[PDB]
C-alpha cells in the first residue's frame, strides 16, 4: 500500500533511484491536477507523495553517508562533514593525554610520596 522505510533499506541503490524517479513524476501529475480543478480526494494524495519522496531521499542519503564513514574509517584525515561537530571550543581542547602530561619530577612525587590512607584512633 504505502511506503515502508524498513523495506526501502533492503533495496539496492539503483532501485531507490528508480522509485524516486517514479514518485517525482507522480507528484508532477498531482500538481497539474491541483491547478486544473482536480478532485478533493486527489489533492489529499499530494501530502502522501511528498512524504514518500522525502523518505526515499532520506534512505539514499543515510546509506551514502554510512558507506563514506566506512571508507574513511581508520584514516588520519577525514572530510570536514564527517568529522565530529561537538562545539568549536571542545574541538580546540587539549586531548585527555595532553592535559595529564607532567614533568619528570612531578611523576616521581606521585610515586614516591602519594597521598596515604590513614585514620586517627578514637
Amino acid at each position: 500500500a504505502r511506503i515502508k522505510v524498513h523495506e526501502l533499506r533492503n533495496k539496492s541503490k539503483t532501485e531507490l533511484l528508480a522509485q524516486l524517479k517514479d514518485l517525482k513524476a507522480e507528484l508532477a501529475l498531482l500538481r497539474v491536477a491541483k491547478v486544473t480543478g482536480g478532485a478533493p480526494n486527489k489533492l489529499s494524495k499530494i501530502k502522501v507523495v511528498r512524504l514518500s519522496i522525502a523518505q526515499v531521499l532520506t534512505v539514499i542519503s543515510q546509506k551514502q553517508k554510512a558507506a563514506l564513514r566506512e571508507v574513511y574509517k581508520n584514516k588520519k584525515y577525514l572530510p570536514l562533514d564527517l568529522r565530529p561537530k561537538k562545539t568549536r571550543a571542545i574541538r580546540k581542547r587539549l586531548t585527555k593525554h595532553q592535559s595529564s602530561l607532567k614533568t619528570e619530577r612531578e611523576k616521581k612525587k606521585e610515586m614516591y610520596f602519594p597521598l596515604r590512607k590513614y585514620a586517627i584512633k578514637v
Binding site: 587539549l94 586531548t95 614533568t103
Partner: peptide, 8 residues
C-alpha cells in the same frame, strides 16, 4: 607545544 607539559 601541545605535548610539552611546561608550556601547554
Amino acid at each position: 607545544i601541545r605535548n610539552d607539559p611546561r608550556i601547554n
